[PDB]
Design an enzyme around this catalytic site. Sequence first.
Site, short mmCIF file in Angstrom:
data_model
loop_
_atom_site.label_atom_id
_atom_site.label_comp_id
_atom_site.label_asym_id
_atom_site.label_seq_id
_atom_site.Cartn_x
_atom_site.Cartn_y
_atom_site.Cartn_z
CG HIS A 1 -1.68 1.34 1.36
ND1 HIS A 1 -3.04 1.45 1.10
CD2 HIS A 1 -1.27 2.58 1.73
CE1 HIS A 1 -3.42 2.70 1.32
NE2 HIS A 1 -2.36 3.40 1.70
CD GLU A 2 1.62 3.49 3.83
OE1 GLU A 2 1.53 4.46 3.05
OE2 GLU A 2 0.89 3.38 4.85
CG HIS B 1 -6.00 6.57 0.63
ND1 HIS B 1 -6.13 7.30 1.80
CD2 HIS B 1 -4.81 5.93 0.73
CE1 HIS B 1 -5.07 7.09 2.56
NE2 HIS B 1 -4.25 6.26 1.93
ZN LIG Z 1 -2.56 5.31 2.34
#
Ligand SMILES: [Zn+2]
Lengths: 161, 175
Positions: free
Chosen positions: A115-116, A125
Amino acid sequence: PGIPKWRKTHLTYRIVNYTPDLPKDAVDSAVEKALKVWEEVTPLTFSRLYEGEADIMISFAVREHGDFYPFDGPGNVLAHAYAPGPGINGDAHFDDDEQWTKDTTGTNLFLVAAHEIGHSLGLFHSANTEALMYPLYHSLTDLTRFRLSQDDINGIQSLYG
Amino acid sequence: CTCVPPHPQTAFCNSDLVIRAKFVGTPEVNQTTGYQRYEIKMTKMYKGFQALDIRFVYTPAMESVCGYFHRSHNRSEEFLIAGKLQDGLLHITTCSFVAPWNSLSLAQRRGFTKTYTVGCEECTVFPCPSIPCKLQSGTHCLWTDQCLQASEKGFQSRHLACLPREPGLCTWQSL
Ligand SMILES: [Zn+2]
Ligand SMILES: [Ca+2]
Ligand SMILES: [Ca+2]
Ligand SMILES: [Ca+2]
Ligand SMILES: [Zn+2]
């Protein structure tokens, strides 16, 4: 209006730092796999650096930490990252006040990293709970059958095609 | 940004301020500090009478770095905000407990109003990711909702508080 993306397709990364919750080795695999989910669907490529400044700097920290946005102890924020750019940008920070694990029993280093890194490549997002770029941590992925979501592939491929 | 948003009771106990407020303007970005702020009209306060009314909420200027972006265009919709007090300013992140007052359960509004504060001193809502979870103490209540949006949509989150039955002992109870 500004849509951040790396202007080169070959990036570099360095793990500047190691959490004690894991061997200095599982940590590497975690990051490696998380870079790999994004590399598999794009022209992106990654070289690793062990000294000096990389495009993507990966570090573990607690509380006061060294930028504008301090971590908060255990729970709530687990990690954060910056959009593509020079400096602090591209970097990914992990709150070492979580217990980082290989599996699901704790906070899964691989999941959060993936995710990062998405943020380091220029993704925002997702409103889709199926997506990796959904901001809640998917506590229940079994990992065995983890695949990149379609919303996620469309996102990264809109940037680097 | 990656969040495990807290159980409402946790949010109450660990926040410095707990209030109802309306969101009135667009955020201003303030690039010297790295934070954007929203102007708010407070309508009620539940926690935080040891301060100064408050007119603003602050949060990270970027989504990537856990900035709260306000989706509703409101302008009269009351929201519950649970945030920390940094240097005399109300601070939240996208991980904070922020939600439309009306969208809360009855058990969640009772509780923000009265019930929760009973559990703050002696009890702890501990987040259970994968089962099995280890129970670290008898005053821990395991939070076992494994909804993706456990905080917003989970049974225990939406109906139960972690309260003492006796000293050394806390359990989930119904409001
Ligand atoms: Zn995030
Ligand atoms: Ca960088
Ligand atoms: Ca944290
Ligand atoms: Ca740790
Ligand atoms: Zn940081």
